Amino acid sequence: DKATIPSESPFAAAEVADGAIVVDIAKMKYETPELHVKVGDTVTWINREAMPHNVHFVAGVLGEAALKGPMMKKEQAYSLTFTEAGTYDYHCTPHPFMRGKVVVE
């Protein structure tokens, strides 16, 4: 796959790793909708609002299968470690008007 998943479960915002590249989610938006990172970086989304959100990459984007991330409650977080350069678009499953991308370069 083009990204690995350190934790299939969401985890607490306080449990975010040093060195992770954080994208906050608030006001029904990914606060960094176009994030540029390097191969090997871990991106961590942190939900800062009451409304639950996830990240969802359709099949073929991060690998053969779709990656439908777990729903994050407020102050929960979720990581992906990107292993291959490319452009990886995602959306929020319940809120598909929320769109973002990670550009690994």
Is residue 48 at the binding interface for Cu ion, with CB under 5 A as the rule? no
Nearer to Na ion by Cβ, of 13 and 103: the residue is 13
**How many whole angstroms separate alpha carbon 37 and alpha carbon 105?**
6
Residue 3 interacts, among Cu ion, Na ion, none and using kind-specific CB cut-offs from 5 to 8 Å, with: none
**How many whole angstroms separate alpha carbon 97 and alpha carbon 91?**
7
Q: Which residues pair with 28 in a beta bridge?
A: none
Binding range to Cu ion, per CB under 5 A, among 6-14, 30-38, 45-53, 65-73: 45-53
| Chain position carrying tokens 């991308």 | 101
For the record, the structure tokens of 45 come out as 């989304």
- Binding to Na ion (CB under 5 A) within 2-41 occurs at 27-28
* Size of residue set near Na ion by CB under 5 A: 2
